Write an enzyme that holds these catalytic residues in place. Structure first.
Site, PDB file in Angstrom:
ATOM      1  N   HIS B  44       0.790  -0.969  -0.082  1.00  0.00           N
ATOM      2  CA  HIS B  44      -0.162  -0.315   0.153  1.00  0.00           C
ATOM      3  C   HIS B  44       1.152   1.020  -0.117  1.00  0.00           C
ATOM      4  O   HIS B  44       1.850   1.119   0.446  1.00  0.00           O
ATOM      5  CB  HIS B  44      -0.589  -0.149   1.940  1.00  0.00           C
ATOM      6  CG  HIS B  44      -1.418  -0.779   1.711  1.00  0.00           C
ATOM      7  ND1 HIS B  44      -0.976  -1.740   3.112  1.00  0.00           N
ATOM      8  CD2 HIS B  44      -1.807  -1.897   0.917  1.00  0.00           C
ATOM      9  CE1 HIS B  44      -1.862  -3.016   3.299  1.00  0.00           C
ATOM     10  NE2 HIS B  44      -2.195  -3.271   1.929  1.00  0.00           N
ATOM     11  N   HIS B  46       1.460   4.472   1.793  1.00  0.00           N
ATOM     12  CA  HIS B  46       1.068   4.756   3.159  1.00  0.00           C
ATOM     13  C   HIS B  46       1.108   6.751   2.683  1.00  0.00           C
ATOM     14  O   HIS B  46       1.802   6.907   2.052  1.00  0.00           O
ATOM     15  CB  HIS B  46       2.067   4.524   4.480  1.00  0.00           C
ATOM     16  CG  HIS B  46       2.072   3.242   4.920  1.00  0.00           C
ATOM     17  ND1 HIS B  46       1.254   2.798   5.977  1.00  0.00           N
ATOM     18  CD2 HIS B  46       0.917   1.822   3.706  1.00  0.00           C
ATOM     19  CE1 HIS B  46       1.477   1.596   6.307  1.00  0.00           C
ATOM     20  NE2 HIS B  46       1.246   0.924   4.737  1.00  0.00           N
ATOM     21  N   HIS B  61      -2.605   4.693   5.964  1.00  0.00           N
ATOM     22  CA  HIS B  61      -2.612   4.432   4.356  1.00  0.00           C
ATOM     23  C   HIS B  61      -3.473   5.918   3.771  1.00  0.00           C
ATOM     24  O   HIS B  61      -4.122   6.454   4.773  1.00  0.00           O
ATOM     25  CB  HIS B  61      -3.667   3.550   3.601  1.00  0.00           C
ATOM     26  CG  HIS B  61      -3.227   2.246   4.148  1.00  0.00           C
ATOM     27  ND1 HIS B  61      -4.194   0.635   4.201  1.00  0.00           N
ATOM     28  CD2 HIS B  61      -2.421   1.762   4.833  1.00  0.00           C
ATOM     29  CE1 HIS B  61      -3.727  -0.801   4.743  1.00  0.00           C
ATOM     30  NE2 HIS B  61      -2.813   0.131   4.895  1.00  0.00           N
ATOM     31  N   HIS B  69     -10.635   0.868   4.471  1.00  0.00           N
ATOM     32  CA  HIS B  69      -9.582   0.045   4.026  1.00  0.00           C
ATOM     33  C   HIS B  69     -10.560  -1.073   2.945  1.00  0.00           C
ATOM     34  O   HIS B  69     -11.722  -1.529   3.308  1.00  0.00           O
ATOM     35  CB  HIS B  69      -8.820  -0.376   4.888  1.00  0.00           C
ATOM     36  CG  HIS B  69      -7.839  -1.386   4.133  1.00  0.00           C
ATOM     37  ND1 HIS B  69      -7.122  -0.951   3.774  1.00  0.00           N
ATOM     38  CD2 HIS B  69      -7.950  -3.055   4.408  1.00  0.00           C
ATOM     39  CE1 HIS B  69      -5.947  -2.445   2.882  1.00  0.00           C
ATOM     40  NE2 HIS B  69      -6.536  -3.649   3.475  1.00  0.00           N
ATOM     41  N   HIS B  78      -9.509   2.942   0.891  1.00  0.00           N
ATOM     42  CA  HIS B  78      -8.343   3.865   0.806  1.00  0.00           C
ATOM     43  C   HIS B  78      -7.745   4.032  -0.706  1.00  0.00           C
ATOM     44  O   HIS B  78      -7.281   3.550  -1.435  1.00  0.00           O
ATOM     45  CB  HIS B  78      -7.310   3.438   1.918  1.00  0.00           C
ATOM     46  CG  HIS B  78      -7.870   3.280   2.891  1.00  0.00           C
ATOM     47  ND1 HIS B  78      -6.865   2.792   3.940  1.00  0.00           N
ATOM     48  CD2 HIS B  78      -8.320   4.043   3.200  1.00  0.00           C
ATOM     49  CE1 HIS B  78      -7.500   2.601   5.226  1.00  0.00           C
ATOM     50  NE2 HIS B  78      -8.653   3.228   4.744  1.00  0.00           N
ATOM     51  N   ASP B  81      -4.922   1.511  -1.089  1.00  0.00           N
ATOM     52  CA  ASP B  81      -5.112   0.041  -1.297  1.00  0.00           C
ATOM     53  C   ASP B  81      -4.245  -0.482  -2.641  1.00  0.00           C
ATOM     54  O   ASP B  81      -5.780  -0.625  -3.092  1.00  0.00           O
ATOM     55  CB  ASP B  81      -6.379   0.357  -1.030  1.00  0.00           C
ATOM     56  CG  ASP B  81      -6.923   0.594   0.880  1.00  0.00           C
ATOM     57  OD1 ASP B  81      -5.762   0.595   1.762  1.00  0.00           O
ATOM     58  OD2 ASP B  81      -7.696   0.865   0.901  1.00  0.00           O
ATOM     59  N   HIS B 118       4.257  -5.292   3.432  1.00  0.00           N
ATOM     60  CA  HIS B 118       3.679  -5.514   4.936  1.00  0.00           C
ATOM     61  C   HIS B 118       4.014  -7.737   4.719  1.00  0.00           C
ATOM     62  O   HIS B 118       4.658  -7.922   3.573  1.00  0.00           O
ATOM     63  CB  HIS B 118       2.324  -5.723   4.527  1.00  0.00           C
ATOM     64  CG  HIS B 118       1.870  -4.361   5.087  1.00  0.00           C
ATOM     65  ND1 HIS B 118       1.829  -4.029   6.319  1.00  0.00           N
ATOM     66  CD2 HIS B 118       1.500  -3.625   4.196  1.00  0.00           C
ATOM     67  CE1 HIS B 118       1.653  -2.573   6.390  1.00  0.00           C
ATOM     68  NE2 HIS B 118       1.269  -2.281   5.042  1.00  0.00           N
ATOM     69  N   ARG B 141       5.837  -3.642   8.146  1.00  0.00           N
ATOM     70  CA  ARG B 141       6.456  -2.844   7.462  1.00  0.00           C
ATOM     71  C   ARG B 141       7.447  -3.628   7.260  1.00  0.00           C
ATOM     72  O   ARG B 141       8.319  -3.584   7.976  1.00  0.00           O
ATOM     73  CB  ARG B 141       6.386  -1.695   7.474  1.00  0.00           C
ATOM     74  CG  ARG B 141       4.905  -1.222   8.174  1.00  0.00           C
ATOM     75  CD  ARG B 141       4.945   0.029   8.634  1.00  0.00           C
ATOM     76  NE  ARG B 141       3.786   0.290   8.995  1.00  0.00           N
ATOM     77  CZ  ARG B 141       3.374   1.775   8.970  1.00  0.00           C
ATOM     78  NH1 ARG B 141       3.828   2.819   8.653  1.00  0.00           N
ATOM     79  NH2 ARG B 141       1.526   2.161   9.440  1.00  0.00           N
TER      80      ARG B 141
HETATM   81 CU   LIG Z   1       0.049  -0.139   4.161  1.00  0.00          CU
HETATM   82 ZN   LIG Z   2      -5.592   0.739   3.402  1.00  0.00          ZN
END
Ligand SMILES: [Cu+2]
Ligand SMILES: [Zn+2]
Ligand SMILES: [Cu+2]
Ligand SMILES: [Zn+2]
Lengths: 151, 151
Positions: B44, B46, B61, B69, B78, B81, B118, B141
């Site tokens: 994603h 951030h 995010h 999400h 988001h 995403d 992730h 992360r």
């Molecule tokens: Cu993330």
């Molecule tokens: Zn998200």
């Protein structure tokens, strides 16, 4: 964006954190860099925020108005030309600059570009050889980082 | 800004280079990530391009529209995403994503923000718990980088 930050890292010991903040119509640059040799070091915004080959892929100085290199106070300067930072006995340089050409948004935006700390003093475009008019003879890139949006 | 690049680094073996290109009204995301465990990993954008505390200072995010999400194909998601990337037995994930919500300019611009890979698969907002609707339960992360302007 009104605030930006950059973490400088390289292959040696040079490291630092620079913050950028839009205060009024100008941008205030603050921070500190450690691991430097004593004296002046060229400090510039390079055009690309590309760290695929270390500081090398950062390209040349950000120069949207296609000028020659100069000091921060000259009219004929690259937008990326922020002069020199000065390291003390201990290798610490404290950054405190106000600049009228860079921005955090629009055409002069340096978000997504790269902050580079150089091995030698920037001669401000007055060294007298062709290289002066390009990089100020500032030499190698000791550390760099991509400029990102900060909270 | 029509092209961008991100170099993902962390404290473990995960690393990668992600490229972004504006095509029509979409952003085409390509590249590869290595050193990952076999399987799916949430991927994603951030909010902050702040790496002062590693990937942790990247914030949550990127969600300028204050939605929950979801997966990339959902209406409720988001802007950051992008779903999951899949690493093979050798730990390599090839990224090939086309997305219409992220952009390289304007309001939804991701230039200057952080790309994060992730530890676990992103559940796409369908995990049944509350975390599912914030983070997809993607876990820690592993590696991240600031998105910069590329040539
Ligand atoms: Cu993330
Ligand atoms: Zn998200
Ligand atoms: Cu330079
Ligand atoms: Zn210059």
């Amino acid at each position: 964006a009104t605030k930006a930050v950059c973490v400088l890292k390289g292959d040696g010991p040079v490291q630092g954190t620079i913050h950028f903040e839009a205060k009024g119509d100008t941008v205030v640059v603050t921070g500190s860099i450690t691991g430097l040799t004593e004296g002046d070091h060229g400090f510039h915004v390079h055009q690309f925020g590309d760290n695929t080959q270390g500081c090398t892929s950062a390209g040349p100085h950000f120069n949207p108005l296609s000028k020659k290199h100069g000091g921060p106070k000259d009219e004929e300067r690259h937008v990326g030309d922020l002069g020199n930072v000065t390291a003390d006995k201990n290798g610490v340089a404290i950054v405190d600059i106000v600049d009228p050409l860079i921005s955090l948004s629009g055409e002069y935006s340096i978000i997504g570009r790269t902050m580079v700390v150089h091995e030698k003093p920037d001669d401000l475009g007055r060294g007298g050889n062709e290289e002066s008019t390009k990089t100020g003879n500032a030499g190698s890139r000791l550390a760099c980082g991509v400029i990102g949006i900060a909270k």
